[PDB]
């Protein structure tokens, strides 16, 4: 289903959507695919990170690159994941590799590989609307980030360019409230959720990203379901 439908389904079920984040090729190519199999049952949508040169996420990118991850490698993995699910798949990437390959080619390749959209953490959309438009015209939803320091004007500016959803990073209820005042777009948040309690604090958002917690689980060689189940139980809105 579409990104909006994935978020809507979660909301209707009275819960914040669970969005696993997995670094492409971490801890290995096979390990990554196995991880995808384990998180999909819990995922409303999935984020796949393109490793490029937070401490935990940094460790994962570092190991992935040391093992040979590349844009071509990430492309094949996106195809592999698309073969396993019809759920929304978002590629998170810094601008550097996009510029190296050329925006039109980079975005075109990932859209063709099966990506639903891209998350561009280091691109203020208002600074290059043309680049944003290009990705959108190619068929990719474009997610941009907002920090707690964002003024009303900054929030308004970013939500004007975002599609799919808006990503708020680091209290959570306050930031979510302020963003919803300027948009009907789903709002996902990421602040190191690691269990039921921290997930409950984030339950107010339309979606909650889980990245660092999964890196740790993978490093420790633990099954992922127990962790995701605790988080899912915390994402469920109660009386
Ligand atoms: O919030 P955590 O610890 O679950 O990480 C979620 C991973 C999303 C993520 C990966 N790399 C980033 C760079 C900037 C902002 C967010 C990210």
Curated annotation (Swiss-Prot):
Keyword list, A-Z: Amino-acid biosynthesis, Aromatic amino acid biosynthesis, Lyase, Tryptophan biosynthesis
Family named by the database record: Belongs to the TrpA family.
GO molecular function, a single term: tryptophan synthase activity
Broadest EC class assigned to this enzyme: lyase
The protein's name: Tryptophan synthase alpha chain
CDD domains associated with the record: Tryptophan_synthase_alpha
InterPro entries the record matches: Aldolase_TIM, RibuloseP-bd_barrel, Trp_synthase_alpha_AS, Trp_synthase_suA
NCBIfam families tied to this protein: trpA
Assembly notes: Tetramer of two alpha and two beta chains.
Function of the protein: The alpha subunit is responsible for the aldol cleavage of indoleglycerol phosphate to indole and glyceraldehyde 3-phosphate.
SUPFAM superfamilies in alphabetical order: Ribulose-phoshate binding barrel
Catalytic activity line of the entry: (1S,2R)-1-C-(indol-3-yl)glycerol 3-phosphate + L-serine = D-glyceraldehyde 3-phosphate + L-tryptophan + H2O
Active site per UniProt: 47 (proton acceptor)
Entry keyword annotation includes Chaperone: no
Enzyme Commission numbers on file: 4.2.1.20
Record organism: Thermus thermophilus (strain ATCC BAA-163 / DSM 7039 / HB27)
Entries under PROSITE patterns matching the protein: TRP_SYNTHASE_ALPHA
Listed pathway(s): Amino-acid biosynthesis; L-tryptophan biosynthesis; L-tryptophan from chorismate: step 5/5
Keyword Lyase attributed: yes
GO CC field: cytosol
């Amino acid at each position: 289903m579409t990104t909006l439908e994935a978020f809507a389904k979660a909301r209707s079920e009275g819960r914040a959507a669970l969005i696993p984040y997995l670094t492409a090729g971490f801890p290995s190519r096979e390990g990554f695919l196995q991880a995808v199999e384990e998180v999909l049952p819990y995922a409303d949508l999935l984020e796949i990170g393109l490793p490029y040169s937070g401490p935990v996420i940094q460790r994962a990118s570092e190991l992935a690159l040391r093992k040979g991850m590349s844009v071509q490698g990430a492309l094949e993995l996106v195809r592999e994941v698309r073969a396993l699910t019809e759920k929304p798949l978002f590629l998170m990437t810094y601008l550097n590799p996009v510029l190296a390959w050329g925006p039109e080619r980079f975005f075109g390749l990932f859209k063709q590989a099966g990506a639903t959209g891209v998350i561009l953490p280091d691109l203020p959309p208002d600074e290059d609307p043309g680049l944003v438009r290009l990705a959108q015209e190619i068929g990719l939803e474009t997610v941009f980030l907002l920090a707690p320091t964002s003024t009303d004007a900054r929030i308004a500016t970013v939500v004007r360019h975002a599609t799919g959803f808006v990503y708020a990073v680091s209290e959570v209820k306050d930031l979510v409230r302020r963003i919803k005042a300027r948009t009907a777009l789903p709002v996902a948040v990421g602040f190191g959720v690691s269990g039921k309690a921290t997930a409950a604090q984030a339950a107010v958002a339309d979606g909650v990203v889980v990245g660092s917690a999964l890196v740790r689980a993978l490093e420790e060689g633990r099954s992922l379901a127990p962790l995701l189940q605790e988080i899912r139980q915390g994402l469920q809105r109660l009386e």
